[PDB]
Amino acid sequence: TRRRAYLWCKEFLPGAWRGLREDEFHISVIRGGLSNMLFQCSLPDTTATLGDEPRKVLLRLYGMVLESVMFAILAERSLGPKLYGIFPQGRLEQFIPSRRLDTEELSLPDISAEIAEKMATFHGMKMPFNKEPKWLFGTMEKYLKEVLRIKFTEESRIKKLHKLLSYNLPLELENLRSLLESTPSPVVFCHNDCQEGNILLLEGRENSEKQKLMLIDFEYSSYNYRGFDIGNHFCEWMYDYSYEKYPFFRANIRKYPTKKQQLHFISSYLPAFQNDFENLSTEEKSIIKEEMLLEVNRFALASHFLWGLWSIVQAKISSIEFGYMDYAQARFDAYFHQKRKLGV
Amino acid sequence: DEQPEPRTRRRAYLWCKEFLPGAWRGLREDEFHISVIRGGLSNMLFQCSLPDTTATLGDEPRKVLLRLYGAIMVLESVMFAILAERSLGPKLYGIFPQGRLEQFIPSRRLDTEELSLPDISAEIAEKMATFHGMKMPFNKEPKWLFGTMEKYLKEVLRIKFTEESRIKKLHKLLSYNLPLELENLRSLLESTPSPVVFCHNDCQEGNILLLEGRENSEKQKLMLIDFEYSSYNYRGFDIGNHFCEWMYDYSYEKYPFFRANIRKYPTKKQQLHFISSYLPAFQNDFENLSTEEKSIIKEEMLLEVNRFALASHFLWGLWSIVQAKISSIEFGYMDYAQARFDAYFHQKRKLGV
Ligand SMILES: CN1CCCN(Cc2ccc(CN)cc2)CC1
Ligand SMILES: CN1CCCN(Cc2ccc(CN)cc2)CC1
């Protein structure tokens, strides 16, 4: 691996990387794990670059074709990290000096204003993928059917899974389908996982007011209802994954964005998504806003439902230390709370 | 043949309707237009279009090219997407397991005898030099050339024909002792400096588009397409291979379905004219180096591309023998293998190597 990374870096990267010896190779882990291990490879500080090649790069081990075409495209358009090399068991990507946002930072008005802008821009991109909005319910159905086949060993998971099934998930899915079918929402290229863990604060521009963030990790990206990408992100205000004691997240329902905070986000989103929106009548803009509010708060329900089902699947299979079943139970609690709140 | 089959076209209609924007997304089957551009079993080509009475709503193309992979993949897909993003290849509208949907570019392909026309050649040299300066996310080790020839050689040595004429042709070719000859070629090219760049690797006339509405422009009427063989490789191979293609006409309508003419290989003058467009297009300062150091570069570069042209004959000669066992396409692959090795040894004699 330290050699594998050495070979991949020597062979895929230009400049000093070409003549690099193996005892000159600097690598360290950025994230271990079982799948998608991140690494930081870099030149001797005492090595001068020959061209415009990078000094430090991010390696990503997968641990099919669409994810690669996608990442290449975003790289080409300067929407994503640059792609320096791609191979069967991973790829070399640009290393972006940054940190991830924290949960509570999402509510900072400049941060959520720029996230809205960035998601709007992400949303207007054309991609060579299927533009039929199959993804949302196709994945929920795929997960549900996995869930009604999962058998757990340990009494606790059995107990928890038994509570979740008692909601009558198949019937509840139909009630959700019914509601969203009656809720218009333009299909656009969605990130589908726009949580704080996937938003870079680019270092050196913490002082920029509108250009300090980048969106990354598009493994779930597809054409999907705009409402889901926004409602999902709103849900993510509630969940903090940096908690260091099992179950390794906190949910806080009170942290869901207020009407005022929602209007602030979409008041950024809309002008960045349709460049003619800014010239509409004050009244019309509020017609569109009030209507969008209903839209994304309904699709928020699908965020809860989808990730709840996903969280149950991950329990049975994942190695990652995370209280998946407790998270599923949190997502469904927020699902039913949001139903009562909306009166739907 | 013009009419697609019922199966494909029903599937074509679905792909177009779901992958393309605008008027495409609400088209009915009954108003979908599709025409064959190439049959076969491997890369079927179709033209797909809106009715002419139907109005585009926005960006969407009125016509696209459907490409089915047929009987056979991430590197090729990524490469095609990148070149589209950079406006070097056809735009990519749709990608899926069975194939892709690409921009339709009104054009015909160049004829073999057009490769030598001065303005054509100059631009082909600019386009290729441009093609070479690109950064691509692939392995930058120049192992494709001999890796590929080695793969073909090993397959070639263990294929047994039945059919007699195929069998006799294979025997004359093995007479030459290809493995030793391959090694001989390695030593010769091992001593021949050539910059490793991103090569098309199959820059023949049928992979160059003459763009419609531009037959007047002098330096902007061509586009290079079909990059299935592309990879980081010795610059000499890419140009050498192109010079070799001057000699082969695949439009010949009877068996073996090509004409070889060694007399059509570019003259020293024509080669210089080509690399005279290539070099200022490939590197910055070149245009204004001492007329005396421009010549050393040119002369050396000729030696290089003419030596690497030997790998062109050897690679496709081997490829061709492999194709004679596995391909069902009507083409005299064995005869073409011999034709390539004739030129190889004839080229060897020319170079005194
Ligand atoms: C799939 N995503 C959307 C739903 C929330 N996920 C839950 C999660 C958080 C942290 C960890 C720790 N590896 C695992 C799962 C993370 C991202
Ligand atoms: C792979 N390329 C480089 C070598 C020349 N080839 C020979 C060939 C031409 C036409 C046909 C079509 N019958 C088949 C093979 C095809 C292009």
Swiss-Prot record, chain A:
Keywords of this entry: Acetylation, ATP-binding, Cytoplasm, Disease variant, Epilepsy, Intellectual disability, Kinase, Lipid biosynthesis, Lipid droplet, Lipid metabolism, Nucleotide-binding, Phospholipid biosynthesis, Phospholipid metabolism, Phosphoprotein, Transferase, Tyrosine-protein kinase
EC class of the enzyme, as a word: transferase
Phenotype upon changing residue 166 to A: Abolished phosphorylation by AMPK, preventing localization to lipid droplets and subsequent acetylation by KAT5
EC number: 2.7.1.32, 2.7.1.82
Keyword Nucleotide-binding: yes
Positions bound to phosphocholine: 33-35
UniProt binding sites for ATP: 31-37, 60, 94-100, 195, 217
GO molecular function, one term: ATP binding
Modified residues (Phosphoserine): 166
Catalytic activities: choline + ATP = phosphocholine + ADP + H(+); ethanolamine + ATP = phosphoethanolamine + ADP + H(+)
Major subcellular site: cytoplasm
Job description of the protein: Plays a key role in phospholipid biosynthesis by catalyzing the phosphorylation of free choline to phosphocholine, the first step in phosphatidylcholine biosynthesis. Also phosphorylates ethanolamine, thereby contributing to phosphatidylethanolamine biosynthesis. Has higher activity with choline. May contribute to tumor cell growth.
Associated pathology: Neurodevelopmental disorder with microcephaly, movement abnormalities, and seizures: An autosomal recessive neurodevelopmental disorder characterized by severe global developmental delay, impaired intellectual development, microcephaly, early-onset seizures, and movement abnormalities.
Subunit comment: Homodimer. Heterodimer with CHKB.
Protein name as catalogued: Choline kinase alpha
Record lineage: Eukaryota, Metazoa, Chordata, Craniata, Vertebrata
Gene: CHKA
Full-sequence range covered: 87 to 457 of 457
